[PDB]
Design a protein around this ligand. Structure first.
Ligand SMILES: CCCCCCCCCCCCCCCCCC(=O)OC[C@H](COP(=O)([O-])OCC(O)COP(=O)([O-])OC[C@@H](COC(=O)CCCCCCCCCCCCCCCCC)OC(=O)CCCCCCCCCCCCCCCCC)OC(=O)CCCCCCCCCCCCCCCCC
Ligand SMILES: COC1=C(OC)C(=O)C(C/C=C(\C)CC/C=C(/C)CC/C=C(/C)CC/C=C(\C)CC/C=C(/C)CC/C=C(\C)CC/C=C(\C)CC/C=C(\C)CC/C=C(/C)CCC=C(C)C)=C(C)C1=O
Ligand SMILES: CCCCCCCCCCCCCCCCCC(=O)OC[C@H](COP(=O)([O-])OCC[N+](C)(C)C)OC(=O)CCCCCCCCCCCCCCCCC
Ligand SMILES: CCCCCCCCCCCCCCCCCC(=O)OC[C@H](COP(=O)(O)OCCN)OC(=O)CCCCCCCCCCCCCCCCC
Lengths: 99, 318, 40, 171, 115, 347, 175, 96, 83, 98
């Protein structure tokens, strides 16, 4: 913030909610609590323009935990190939996939 | 058999609304020294059938100065919301166990404005355009009081699960704890359904009907069906909310009988009030809630939120 | 000013424009004539 | 970036205790009181390692211990348990409130035959401790090397050389 | 599914009622029926003119109170918190602010239905 | 307008800005923005004339749209990073979106047609409020996010800001309108150096602020809205019109007056960072400002203007409203150049 | 197949929005917003947001009520507009239908639509998360934390609503 | 009356919860095995699925971290029957 | 003295609803601080274990923490039973 | 980013077009403006329910409470131009010109 009265005069005013690894009500963790813990404790007292590159792999792992872009794309590719070869008809899904 | 249960919900409510149009004309008449309808069948039991057939085969006039889309949609909204707003009621085993049943039904209760406004404006008449805004203001200005009353009452129940409300009462009638609140709630209910003491929309001197003026035959009867279904639905709501009953799980029929008796008693109180009292004036009508009802409701809500804390008697959440 | 600036009348000194066409109306009501709430 | 660690289909093969929710909720307090140790150590493993692939053996242990407990209760009063779990099943919330009669009829058997006591309210809720011979999860998150801090600076403030040094200002 | 099935059943049922209502009866369809109505007369040249009104203020203070009602709705869940003292003071703040808004509405005409 | 109601509108506007420059959660920044929006509309409607209604309506529409796009940027960087903390953005289009959302609140780019009009509509005190206080919040947000702003975007936006600020004021006689255009020019001036180093845009904000109070207080000490009306005031208040002239000299940035210092500082740091073409454009275009500045000076003090017969009884009456801080307000906006090193205090 | 409902709930949201933004008669834009909100309540609901969905239901179907309240008061005229009055509204509407239709056709063929950001056409059911909730709803508990952790939020809001009723008083006072 | 009955209801809730804590470990111990069974079944099946594709490293993890994450439910209920995924996602929401 | 009592009487007559609301409200804030059971309500809320009490790794020298869920030592809520 | 995100983002984009590209009506434009915040409300609730951001669960209603306030004044401004000017048609809305 511009004029950070929060840490000067010594109280939290909004910092409780800013990130989702904070003390959530009745210890309900967020979806990416581990990843954002890794990211935050990675980049602490390092400087944003310096920490953005050392804490990179943690950052995109965090972003992929949030959005699952890469994982869902992988699933889409798997489904594409499965439906293609099923339509052109080679194998049948095992009974665990039917019932 | 789910759809069979649905139909067993709608259709009996339809007969209930149908015969309410007979019990009101009998109760009112007996309250004012009139025998009431007893010519169509035994004790007028068949009379609602005849008027329904007449209104179905009465000509539905298309308002020439109107857009038919809303002239047809408004009865749809008013009727369908009124019936689907019966869905989450705690019969001994409620049909749909919605975790926020009370909030669900309170939210749907606000939707009657969305039939009132289109009826009043689309029909395009002076009485219609006046009564639309007047009735809209009525129901919206009483919806707030309904909301704080619901919240303050629920603060002792535990959650918005409307099935556990029975578990809340069990021992004592909930009115014994919130009789000042219920006395407001009931009256606000009387206001939201547009009944003779608080109707203000009919006003058969300067509004005549207010919203159901140009509506004729079927779409006209649909708004009556909505109106006299909200009567039963809100009287049943008040019945469970304040007039609790016993429910043994091995005998579901007992709570059913007790609940229907409570609903009939409350509807009879509705007819009782309308058969006696004069009609409010819009000035006094909104003076009643803005000047008088709302401050008392706010203070009572404060009392009923502070009370569980000081008594160390917060209700169970789950 | 070039051309259209000619039709750009200066604002008044009060900053309030001369009050426009009188919209004051009381929306005449006939309140009848059948109107059975008058003994007919 | 890495592949898998999924244990073999033979590894995650345990006898799945196949009983109903009403039966399980009827056993409950006695089951917990007489089978806490495998359960406690199992989810101590779960919270410490944060890694079920490391706690399959704990799962087998808790399953087998619970199964033994169910075998002993079968060997003894089961008709009171039968009535109790049926009555709990009739409840749509598995409420313990409308079963108290059979509750007594159950609690006495395991008291005078298997030497068990119904845990008091909150008794089976306080956080306990348990010894596990497994080593500590030194890096539960498998975190990498933490970035080095900023270069620490120190030194007393000597006066700025030649004042402001901004354009023509001498001081 | 279930809930959605009930909503579907109700909307279709309502639409059948309106369809029978609007289609079954027979009308001669003569012109002079279309003339509008007002207690014997027609509504002259009105029923769509802009409505010079005053209770607009009541209508808008409705909404302004409805926001705060939404704010205080989470109370039944909120009462199940560890730090009950802060919840008590701050909810009491919310209702006090409700009352203060109503009072300022009151003394400064406001909720007084304008004339 | 109840005096106490007006005070409570004062401090809710000021608290809305304070919430902006003290909060860290992004939602709180938005909340302060609309607190200020919701609070400043009534004071703009204090006079209650149809021009005031026009100005308030245009302000409301522009600022409401801008705040909604602010939440759009908010939601996007939340979606792409899950962090409400105000810092460098992690999605580019979110950064751009916030850039135009704030700019519409500042009046920099073609999102600047509102400010001259709204300034025309409202009273001059509301003009002082609008063109002084309702900049601190968007500038503060732009300062906090200077880590990742598209330099091309900010630079071109500031360039149009100053350019149409200079050109628009040429054909305006209403003092409120020329002041709005001058403020647009100063908006471009600080926002040009915003990406490079925020200390200098803070300094230029301070100088523009002090100059703007020193200006508006002189206007409503002379009670003039048109150039001819100010020209008639060469008589009654000769000292006020002489100070009028000296601060109108401080306007453009003629040395050694105060207004030259921010231009000098901005150009020097722009040249420190290889931007040598860029500063010359505002350096030239400041003459556009100086043009109608000189026109205002000629109408005010340098040339005597034909007064009016009735005007003489005004000689018998004295300004009773003191309108305090005006002396130091003039002085800080005229002679602070020998104190340029003090800029390091802000850093 | 009612599989794609969680998709179509958003889809009817889009084209109910376009007609809402197609600049029709104000009440018809209101109807577009109403169907959009009714179908978006399902979008939040089937994601688990029961309380927030019913909350927006309530407050928003009051909020469009009040914006109606002046539509027949301060916005009607002798000849109210019709959803077929202006010719351009049809063009706006159809331009509303064909854009997201083409984009979803692509997302059904390539699953890598390049419009603005990065998006995959493989439904929405994936993005849900396995887990549990014990005996507490996460959404309700989170919105309940307003009175324990929302220290500043309720204070600043209530202050803003007070200032809001004040400004609503002052601007509409009419001298 | 409400004070005493509500205290009794709190007693009933702590009892029901204590049952929930009692039985949580068994549900967790069955759930991790069940989820790992889904993962392994999908992995073996998708291995046969991906033999033909020239560039698809089998069983890869998109995450650079070696720490195990909770499986995203998509790969959990993947090639499974449509009814299974429909239940797994929208059952609680759709249940009445 | 007399003026305050007369004003209270007039309010109780002129706007009785206002005085009733103001009274019951004024109680609503000042009782919870005065009442001696709100701490017991805090104990009620802390008593309910919405989540699992995850155990601690035993290493010796924690006599306070019970070794077994049936052990006597540890937190107890007999006050809850008596309440 | 699945299709639900596309749909609500795209709904916001057309709300931006509809409100900002004025056709002739001020009331319908602010109606589009309040639909804008509905799109943003749904959008915000999506990630918040998705990622188990338990605290942020209260942000939507908070985001809601202010937004209606804007409309609370918007339509309030609408009457104030309406009683004098006559309609909400913004083409006579020209008096403030220079
Ligand atoms: C550098 C930082 C310090 C800068 C100081 C100089 C600039 C500030 C403004 C001029 C001060 C001198 C003066 O005479 O002021 C009163 C003077 C007279 O008030 P008015 O509203 O013009 O005319 C009505 C009268 O007040 C007649 O009374 P009324 O009942 O009509 O109005 C009540 C009156 C206040 O009445 C009271 O009882 C107080 O209202 C005001 O004074 C307006 C401001 C809001 C209320 C006062 C609270 C201020 C805090 O007003 C002005 O000169 C400008 C009006 C706005 C003043 C506050 C502006 C704050 C933001 C500006 C930028 C600040 C720096 C940012 C960096
Ligand atoms: C001297 O000075 C005077 C005046 O002034 C100066 C006056 O003013 C007046 C004027 C005063 C009067 C006219 C007095 C009227 C007095 C009466 C005795 C007549 C009225 C009597 C009543 C009992 C009052 C009734 C009114 C009620 C209850 C409410 C009023 C408000 C309404 C909105 C009702 C209006 C009427 C409607 C809507 C029509 C009714 C329609 C129905 C009942 C439809 C029913 C449909 C169904 C049942 C459908 C279901 C059917 C079936 C078969 C179910 C099964 C089917 C399936 C498909 C399942 C006078 C005379 C006067 O002297
Ligand atoms: C399909 C389309 C139609 C849908 C509607 C339902 C079917 C049609 C209506 C069927 C019932 C009414 C038939 C006509 C009756 C008639 O004209 O007179 C009846 C008559 C009424 O006689 P009345 O009293 O009118 O006779 C004339 C009297 N004076 C001369 C004084 C004027 O009664 C009967 O015919 C006897 C049987 C009546 C019904 C028996 C059951 C009553 C109790 C249950 C009621 C509720 C469930 C039904
Ligand atoms: C630098 C000067 C820039 C402006 C030059 C052109 C304007 C010259 C004055 C025009 C008006 C003529 C007149 O009659 O002025 C009378 C006025 C008041 O008289 P007096 O009190 O004597 O002023 C000096 C202090 N004793 O006195 C004046 O107006 C004289 C100037 C007063 C202000 C001081 C100069 C500017 C300081 C910044």
């Amino acid at each position: 913030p511009f004029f950070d009265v929060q840490k000067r005069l010594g109280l939290d005013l909004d910092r409780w909610m800013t990130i989702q690894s904070a003390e959530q009500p009745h210890k309900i963790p967020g979806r990416c609590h581990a990843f954002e813990k890794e990211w935050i404790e990675c980049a602490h007292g390092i400087g944003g323009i310096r920490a953005e590159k050392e804490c990179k792999i943690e950052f995109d792992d965090f972003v992929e935990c949030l959005l699952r872009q890469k994982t869902m794309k992988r699933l889409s590719a798997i489904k594409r190939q499965r439906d293609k070869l099923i339509k052109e008809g080679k194998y049948t899904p095992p009974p665990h996939h039917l019932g | 058999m789910f759809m069979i249960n649905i139909l067993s919900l709608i259709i009996p409510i339809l007969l209930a609304v149908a015969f309410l149009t007979l019990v009101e004309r009998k109760v009112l008449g007996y309250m004012q020294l009139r025998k009431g309808p007893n010519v169509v069948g035994p004790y007028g039991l068949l009379q609602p059938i005849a008027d329904a057939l007449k209104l179905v085969t009465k000509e539905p006039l298309r308002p020439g100065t109107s857009s038919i889309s809303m002239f047809i949609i408004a009865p749809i909204l008013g009727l369908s919301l009124a019936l689907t707003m019966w869905v989450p009621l705690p019969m001994p085993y409620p049909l749909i166990n919605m975790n926020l049943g009370v909030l669900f039904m309170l939210a749907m209760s606000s939707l009657a404005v969305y039939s009132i406004l289109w009826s009043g404006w689309a029909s395009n008449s002076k009485y219609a355009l006046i009564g639309a805004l007047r009735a809209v203001a009525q129901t919206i200005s009483y919806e707030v009081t309904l909301a704080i009353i619901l919240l303050s009452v629920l603060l002792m129940n535990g959650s918005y699960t409307l099935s556990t409300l029975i578990t809340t009462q069990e021992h004592i009638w909930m009115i014994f704890t919130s009789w000042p609140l219920a006395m407001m709630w009931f009256i606000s209910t009387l206001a939201e359904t547009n009944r003779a003491p608080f109707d203000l929309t009919e006003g058969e001197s300067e509004l005549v009907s207010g919203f159901n003026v140009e509506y004729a035959a079927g779409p006209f009867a649909m708004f009556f069906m909505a109106e006299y279904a909200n009567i039963i639905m809100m009287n049943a709501f008040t019945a469970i909310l304040f007039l609790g009953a016993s429910h043994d799980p091995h005998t579901p029929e007992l709570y059913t009988i007790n609940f229907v008796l409570k609903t009939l008693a409350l509807t009879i109180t509705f007819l009782w009030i309308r058969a006696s009292y004069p009609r409010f004036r819009y000035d006094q009508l909104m003076h009643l809630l803005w000047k008088s009802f709302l401050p008392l409701t706010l203070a009572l809500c404060m009392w009923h939120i502070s009370l569980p804390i000081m008594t160390a008697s917060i209700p169970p959440q789950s | 000013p070039t051309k259209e600036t000619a039709h750009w009348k200066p604002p008044p000194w009060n900053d309030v424009d001369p009050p426009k066409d009188t919209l004051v109306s009381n929306l005449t009501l006939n309140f009848g004539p059948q109107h059975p709430a008058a003994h007919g | 970036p890495g592949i898998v660690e999924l244990p073999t289909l033979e590894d995650l093969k345990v006898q799945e205790v196949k009983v109903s929710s009403s039966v399980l909720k009827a056993a409950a307090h006695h089951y917990g009181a007489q089978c806490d140790k495998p359960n406690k150590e199992f989810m101590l493993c779960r919270w410490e390692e944060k890694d079920p692939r490391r706690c399959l053996e704990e799962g087998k242990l808790v399953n087998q211990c619970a199964l033994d407990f169910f075998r002993q209760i079968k060997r003894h009063c089961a008709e009171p348990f039968t009535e109790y779990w049926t009555c709990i099943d009739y409840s749509g919330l598995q409420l313990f409130r409308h079963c108290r009669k059979q509750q007594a009829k159950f609690d006495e058997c395991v008291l005078d035959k298997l030497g068990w006591v119904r845990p008091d309210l909150g008794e089976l809720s306080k956080v306990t401790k348990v010894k596990t011979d497994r080593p500590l999860p030194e890096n539960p998150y498998h975190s990498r090397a933490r970035p080095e801090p900023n270069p620490e600076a120190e030194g007393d403030l000597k006066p700025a050389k030649h004042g402001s040094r901004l354009f023509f200002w001498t001081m | 599914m279930n809930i959605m099935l009930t909503l579907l059943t109700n909307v279709t049922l309502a639409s059948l009622l309106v369809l029978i209502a609007f289609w079954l009866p027979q009308l001669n369809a003569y012109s002079e029926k279309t003339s509008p109505y007002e207690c014997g007369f027609d509504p002259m040249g009105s029923a769509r003119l802009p409505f010079s009104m005053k209770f607009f203020l009541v209508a808008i203070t409705f909404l302004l109170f409805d926001l705060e009602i939404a704010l205080l709705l989470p109370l039944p869940w909120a009462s199940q918190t560890n730090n009950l003292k802060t919840m008590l003071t701050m909810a009491l703040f919310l209702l006090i602010l409700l009352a203060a808004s109503l009072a300022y509405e009151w003394t400064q005409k406001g909720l007084e239905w304008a004339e | 307008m109840n005096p106490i109601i007006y005070t409570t509108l004062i401090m809710t506007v000021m608290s809305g800005t304070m919430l902006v420059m003290i909060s860290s959660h992004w939602l709180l920044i938005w909340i302060g923005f609309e607190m200020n929006l919701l609070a400043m509309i009534p004071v703009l409607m204090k006079n209650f004339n149809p021009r005031a209604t026009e100005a308030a309506t245009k302000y409301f529409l522009t600022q409401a749209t801008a705040s909604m796009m602010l939440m759009m940027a908010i939601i996007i960087n939340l979606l792409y990073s899950g962090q409400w903390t105000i810092t460098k953005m992690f999605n580019p289009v979110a950064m751009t979106m916030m850039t135009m959302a704030l700019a519409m609140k500042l009046g920099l780019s073609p999102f600047h047609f509102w400010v001259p009009e709204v300034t025309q509509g409202i009273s001059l005190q509301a003009g002082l409020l609008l063109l002084t206080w309702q900049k601190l919040a968007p500038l503060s947000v732009l300062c906090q996010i200077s880590q990742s702003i598209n330099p091309n975007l900010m630079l071109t936006m500031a360039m149009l800001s100053i350019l149409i600020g200079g050109w628009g004021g040429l054909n305006q006689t209403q003092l409120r309108k020329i002041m709005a255009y001058s403020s647009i020019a100063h908006m471009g001036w600080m926002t040009a150096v915003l990406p490079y180093n925020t200390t200098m845009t803070i300094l230029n904000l301070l100088i523009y602020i002090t100059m703007t109070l020193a200006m508006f207080m002189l206007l409503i000490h002379s009670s003039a809205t048109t150039t001819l009306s100010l020209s008639h005031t060469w008589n009654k208040m000769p000292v006020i019109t002489s100070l009028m002239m000296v601060t109108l000299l401080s306007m453009g940035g003629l040395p050694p007056l105060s207004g030259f210092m921010p231009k000098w500082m901005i150009i020097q740091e722009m040249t420190k960072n290889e931007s040598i073409i860029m500063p010359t454009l505002m350096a030239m275009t400041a003459l556009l400002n100086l043009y109608f500045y000189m026109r205002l000076a000629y109408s005010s003090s340098l040339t005597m203007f034909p007064s009016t017969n009735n005007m003489k009884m005004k000689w018998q009456f004295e300004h009773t409203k003191q309108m305090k801080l005006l002396p130091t307000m003039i002085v800080l906006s005229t002679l602070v150049l020998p104190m340029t090193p003090a800029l390091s205090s802000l850093n | 197949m009612t599989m794609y409902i969680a998709f179509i709930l958003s889809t009817i949201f889009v084209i109910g929005f376009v007609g809402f933004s197609s600049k029709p008669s104000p009440i018809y834009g209101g109807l577009g917003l109403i169907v959009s909100g009714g179908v978006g309540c399902g979008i939040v609901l089937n994601f688990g947001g029961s309380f927030l969905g019913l909350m927006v239901f309530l407050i928003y179907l009051g909020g469009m009520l009040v914006v109606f309240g002046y539509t027949t008061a301060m916005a009607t005229e002798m000849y109210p507009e019709v959803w077929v009055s202006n010719k351009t509204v049809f063009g706006a509407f159809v331009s509303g239908l064909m854009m997201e239709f083409c984009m979803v056709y692509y997302a059904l063929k390539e699953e890598e639509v390049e419009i603005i950001f990065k998006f995959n056409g493989l439904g929405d059911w994936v993005i849900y998360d396995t887990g549990d909730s014990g005996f507490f709803s996460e959404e309700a508990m989170g919105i309940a934390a307003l009175y324990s952790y929302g220290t500043w939020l309720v204070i600043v809001t209530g202050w803003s609503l007070l200032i809001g009723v004040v400004v609503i008083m002052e601007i509409t006072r009419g001298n | 009356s409400m004070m005493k009955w509500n205290r009794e209801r709190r007693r009933l809730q702590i009892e029901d919860f204590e049952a929930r804590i009692a039985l949580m470990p068994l549900f967790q111990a069955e759930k991790d095995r069940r989820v790992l069974q889904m993962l392994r079944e999908n992995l073996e099946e998708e291995a046969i699925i991906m033999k033909d594709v020239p560039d698809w490293k089998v069983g890869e993890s998109v995450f650079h971290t070696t720490r195990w994450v909770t499986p995203m439910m998509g790969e959990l209920y993947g090639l499974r029957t449509n009814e299974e995924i429909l239940s797994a996602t929208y059952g609680f929401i759709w249940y009445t | 003295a007399g003026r305050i009592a007369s004003f209270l009487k007039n309010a109780w007559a002129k706007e009785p609803v206002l005085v009733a609301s103001f009274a019951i409200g004024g109680l609503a804030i000042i009782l919870p601080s005065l009442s001696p059971y709100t701490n017991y309500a805090i104990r009620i809320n802390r008593a309910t274990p919405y989540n699992y009490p995850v155990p601690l790794r035993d290493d010796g020298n924690m006599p306070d923490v019970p070794s077994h869920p049936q052990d006597p030592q540890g937190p107890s809520l007999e006050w809850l039973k008596n309440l | 980013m699945p299709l639900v995100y596309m749909n609500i983002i795209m709904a916001f984009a057309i709300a931006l077009a509809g409100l900002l590209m004025y056709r002739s009506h001020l009331m319908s434009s602010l109606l589009c403006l309040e639909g804008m915040m509905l799109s943003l409300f749904i959008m915000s609730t999506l990630i918040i329910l998705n990622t188990h951001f338990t605290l942020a669960n209260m942000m939507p209603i908070i985001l809601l409470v202010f937004a209606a306030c804007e409309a609370a004044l918007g339509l309030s401004l609408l009457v104030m131009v309406s009683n004098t000017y006559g309609t909400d048609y913004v083409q006579n809305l020209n008096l403030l010109q220079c």
